[PDB]
Amino acid sequence: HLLQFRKMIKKMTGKEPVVSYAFYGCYCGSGGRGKPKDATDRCCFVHDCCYEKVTGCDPKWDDYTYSWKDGDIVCGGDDPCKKEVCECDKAAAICFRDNLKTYKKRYMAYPDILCSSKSEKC
Amino acid sequence: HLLQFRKMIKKMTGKEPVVSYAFYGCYCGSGGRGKPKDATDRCCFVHDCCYEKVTGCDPKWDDYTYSWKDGDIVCGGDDPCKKEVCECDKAAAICFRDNLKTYKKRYMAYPDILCSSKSEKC
Numbered sequence: 001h002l003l004q005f006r007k008m009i010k011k012m013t014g015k016e017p018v019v020s021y022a023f024y025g026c027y028c029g030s031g032g033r034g035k036p037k038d039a040t041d042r043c044c045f046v047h048d049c050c051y052e053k054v055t056g057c058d059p060k061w062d063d064y065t066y067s068w069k070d071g072d073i074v075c076g077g078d079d080p081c082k083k084e085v086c087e088c089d090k091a092a093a094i095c096f097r098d099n100l101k102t103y104k105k106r107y108m109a110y111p112d113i114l115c116s117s118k119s120e121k122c
Numbered sequence: 123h124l125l126q127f128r129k130m131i132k133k134m135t136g137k138e139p140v141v142s143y144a145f146y147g148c149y150c151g152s153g154g155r156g157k158p159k160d161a162t163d164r165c166c167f168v169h170d171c172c173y174e175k176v177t178g179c180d181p182k183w184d185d186y187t188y189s190w191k192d193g194d195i196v197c198g199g200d201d202p203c204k205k206e207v208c209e210c211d212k213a214a215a216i217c218f219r220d221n222l223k224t225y226k227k228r229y230m231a232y233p234d235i236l237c238s239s240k241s242e243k244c
């Protein structure tokens with residue numbers, strides 16, 4: 001569920017994701033088009049590609065089972081599909097953390113009309 | 123160029139293109155994800171697919187050559203890339219016109235977050 005994802009991002013970055021990530025670049029939030037603007041945006045691009053490989057559950061709205069151990073996310077439960085969604089979310093949160101060093105406030109609300117017309121393929 | 127597309131939409135539909143189509147459904151305007159919401163939205167999905175296919179010119183920002191003949195759009199010029207973009211735009215404007223019967227106000231400002239997680243393939 002996207003609000004579980006939010007909690008992962010917030011813990012790993014210390015930022016409010018509704019403000020800092022939900023409108024970032026060409027791929028964060030929305031659906032997305034064009035070329036990722038930077039490494040943070042590429043996290044969202046990959047996250048979008050990850051969700052695309054998922055079939056049989058709703059990655060935005062289905063709750064999955066997760067927990068924390070020493071600051072690491074543990075994806076659990078007895079439902080393989082939902083666990084796959086959890087792993088996508090975990091990977092993106094880790095990516096945001098690992099790329100926080102290049103986060104740019106000028107991309108926080110990047111106008112989607114400025115994204116390139118040719119999208120990068122997964 | 124998108125301004126030319128806008129003129130085509132206005133002339134084909136009688137609707138103010140920005141108000142009426144720029145935020146419609148899941149695919150009209152910048153990017154898009156999920157399943158098209160209705161026929162009008164599918165026009166935009168087709169238009170997006172059309173733009174993604176063009177290579178060698180910028181479908182959003184390059185002007186193309188066109189004219190009106192007896193009220194019909196005629197795409198012209200000697201640049202095949204730009205003519206391809208013009209044909210994308212003409213086809214979409216005609217599609218909007220042809221689907222006015224099912225155009226719905228309920229989709230005119232449809233929140234992207236409410237689009238399906240699984241996007242339709244081109």
Ligand SMILES: O=P(O)(O)OC[C@H](O)CO
Nearest residue numbers: 006017018021022028029
């Ligand atoms: O919905 P948030 O607030 O977790 O942010 C959106 C993500 O960055 C993209 O799914």
Ligand SMILES: [Ca+2]
Nearest residue numbers: 027029031032
């Ligand atoms: Ca996205």
Ligand SMILES: [Ca+2]
Nearest residue numbers: 149151152153
């Ligand atoms: Ca679109």
